[PDB]
Amino acid sequence: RPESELIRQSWRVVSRSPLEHGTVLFARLFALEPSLLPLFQYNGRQFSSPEDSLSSPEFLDHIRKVMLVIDAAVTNVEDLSSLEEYLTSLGRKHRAVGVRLSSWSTVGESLLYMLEKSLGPDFTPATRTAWSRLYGAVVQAMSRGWDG
Ligand code: HEM
């Protein structure tokens, strides 16, 4: 598919520096939804402010893990149903940590933003639409952790 390569070409840019880009994703995400901030409870302590997350080595490890999952979503963009059970259960983990169903769309907006930021003019209206479908397929999978 053409779309699937568009995701693949786009991702390449981001993939190179996962931490720098995921940092953007998370700063954006807390700007949009600041109530995600206390869900991280590294050392049984809440971050007070968004900037405190960036100083947390455990938080940065999480960014890396996030980018790795989006990475898997990319490598499997043509057949994404192979990631489904993983993503379901990652969703369930996240429900437990206290993330809402509604928060996942903000993560998708935040992913999208990180992408727009990184590709600048290369973030075509097609590139956008394709990414939105990919991550939507990721939430949709991460939302089956809310089931039963
Ligand atoms: C939406 C806001 C998010 C919050 C508040 C959040 C929070 C957390 C927390 C607190 C953990 C457990 C502590 C840790 O391993 O660092 C966790 C684990 C994880 N997160 Fe997130 N997360 C979010 C989004 C994401 C997204 C979008 C992804 C990937 C798409 C991601 C991927 C992971 C993975 C891979 C783990 C390890 C899970 C495991 O035990 O198997 N997270 N997250």
Author numbering: 3 to 150
Question: What text comes from the article?
Answer:
To investigate the correlation between mechanical properties and functional efficiency in proteins, we selected neuroglobin (Ngb), a hexacoordinated heme protein, which is expressed in the neurons of vertebrates and is involved in neuroprotection in hypoxic conditions and protects brain from stroke. Ngb folds like all globins with a bundle of eight helices termed A to H, and a heme hexacoordinated in both ferric and ferrous forms by the imidazole side chain of the distal and proximal histidines (His 64 and His 96 respectively). The structures of human and murine Ngb present a large internal cavity behind the heme, that is connected to the surface through a tunnel, forming a pathway toward the heme for gaseous ligands (O2, CO, NO). Like many recently discovered globins, Ngb is characterized by endogenous heme iron hexacoordination in the absence of external ligands.
MPa - The F106W mutant crystal also seems to be more sensitive to pressure than the WT, but more resilient than the V101F mutant. There are no major differences between F106W HP-280 and F106W HP-310. In particular, the tunnel disappears already at 280 MPa and site I disappears at 310 MPa, while site II remains insensitive to pressure (data not shown). The protein mean B-factors are considerably raised by pressure, which could explain why this mutant is more sensitive to pressure than WT Ngb. The residues whose B-factors present a relevant increase with pressure (more than 15 Å2) are mostly located at the back of the protein, while the residues whose B-factors are moderately increased by pressure (less than 5 Å2) are mainly located close to the heme. The effect of pressure seems to be the opposite of what was previously observed in WT Ngb under pressure. In this mutant, the mechanical nucleus still coincides with the hinge region, but the whole protein behaves in a reverse way compared to WT-Ngb, with the zone close to the heme stabilized by pressure and the zone at the back of the protein destabilized by pressure.
